[model samples]
Target chain A: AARKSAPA
Target chain B: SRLFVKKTIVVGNVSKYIPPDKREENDQSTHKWMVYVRGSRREPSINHFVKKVWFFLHPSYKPNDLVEVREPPFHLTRRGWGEFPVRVQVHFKDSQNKRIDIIHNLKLDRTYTGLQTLGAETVVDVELHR
Candidate 1:
């Protein structure tokens, strides 16, 4: 799955 | 494989990098896209429009038809490693109120810190493949 905004 | 796919890199911010593909382009990309050696600097300069290290050295750019990906991410999500190219440039202001610059390509890629595990590290599986 492509991430919308990757987690920090 | 619980994994995503693709192998690519871009060159940029060329400083003290890349031994091959010397000052042949209007500028350079400090990326390990070996293709650049074959692609030459002129094509690369043209690619300044749409560039990526993918096969055919196509542009992985996200045009208006698409949204942009994050510039580039540096994290270890999967145990596997991800490689990508990056660029750096020198800029100057001209009378036309425009910026001018040149490019430089790099020779190699730096390895990651090391591998990791979801607490599932391997025992250096050499006996299997070799």
Candidate 2:
């Protein structure tokens, strides 16, 4: 879950 | 195969406050704080997800100082007497190839309405999206 950091 | 567009994490500083009255008047250093990164609810470690953490402190405390941390316990600690705008930058290991900046207020006084205690903590919950 953490590896795929979101792009805001 | 997978495109998880959202990633969640938590990051903030835990502060220990000391009143100026308790110390000699000449010494006004009032707080010792530690800043770090964590997984949602702090359950799992964020070491693998986050490649590095950068802590930006107030100008008064450094010469454009930038503290970088890598691996587990991504944290930095320091002592200061005043409250200022603190910037926490997170570097993630992903395809976007960009970092994120999070703003947090460094609190040195008991003016906070909730959890009115000396050694309490306040954290920012952040979610990133692609």
Candidate 3:
């Protein structure tokens, strides 16, 4: 699975 | 079991200047570019061993900050005004170590030229059947 895209 | 498999890899960017009028509104990036990871001239098929490529870009590129290329001719395109060290992670199939990390300097300062005429390269030695 790919890592989720979460903004900092 | 095989001990190692070797190949040559290339990674870099192709860029061109953006004329003042052609610039997107609010977008001040001076150049448009495409970054890629591929096999050297001698052997061009990395798909057999490589699973994907992770290109870690500048934080300014949100949502797409961590770009992943899953198919052949791994690459990504964008527009920017500055140069930066792009972090690359090459993921391989059927391997213990799983992946390798590489660093590439994204360039946009000079006049753009044919990528085939010049470039940056790396060699890969994989422990496939370890």
Candidate 4:
């Protein structure tokens, strides 16, 4: 998992 | 656990790193396993088992830069549980006996990998997805 997920 | 990537982590993985492509799916885990901390133990358990599929597009989409987690359990293991994670290259064999594809096995080791390796009396079991 990434540091923070991209918000769509 | 670092990118300088030490033996600190388990077997090295990346058989199909070249020619990255496309596909995407999502995993949502919420298991009530048989123990109180089973939720914790479940994390390392799944990673140890499913990590073998990490680098394969057939298994995952694009080496996922990230897996978006929301109200999801990413870490599993009892507080006293010692853990190990590794990625190994494996060989897939065919019926003709010819070996194909260097398989990568990413694993998490958590077994009280310390001291004399004592045994725990807790009985761990499984249940349906909740």
Greater lDDT among 1 and 2 belongs to 2
Q: What would the TM-score be for candidate 2 when compared with the true structure? A: 0.66
Error of 3 at B104 (Å): 0.4
Q: Candidate 3, B72: how far from true, in Å?
A: 1.5
**Residue B113 lDDT, candidate 2, scale 0-100:** 32
The DockQ values of the predictions, listed in order, are 0.04, 0.02, 0.04, 0.03
Query: Higher-TM-score candidate among 1 and 4?
Result: 1
Query: Which has the better lDDT: candidate 2, or candidate 3?
Result: 3
Model 3 clash pairs? none
lDDT tens per residue, model 4, B7-107: 11122311111111221233221111111111233244333222221122221223542232222222212211111221122221222222122222222
Global local distance difference test of model 2: 0.61
Reference-based lDDT, residue B9, model 4: 19
lDDT of 2 at B95: 35
Q: Which of candidates 2 and 4 reaches a greater DockQ?
A: 4
Q: Tens-digit lDDT track for model 3 on B10-121?
A: 7877777776677878986767778888876776487877889999987777778898888877988887777677788998875674688888877663543322222344
TM-score between predicted and true chain B, model 4: 0.16
Say which candidate scores most in lDDT: 3
Q: Interface RMSD for candidate number 2? A: 13.9
Instruction: Report iRMS values in order.
Output: 8.8, 13.9, 11.3, 13.8
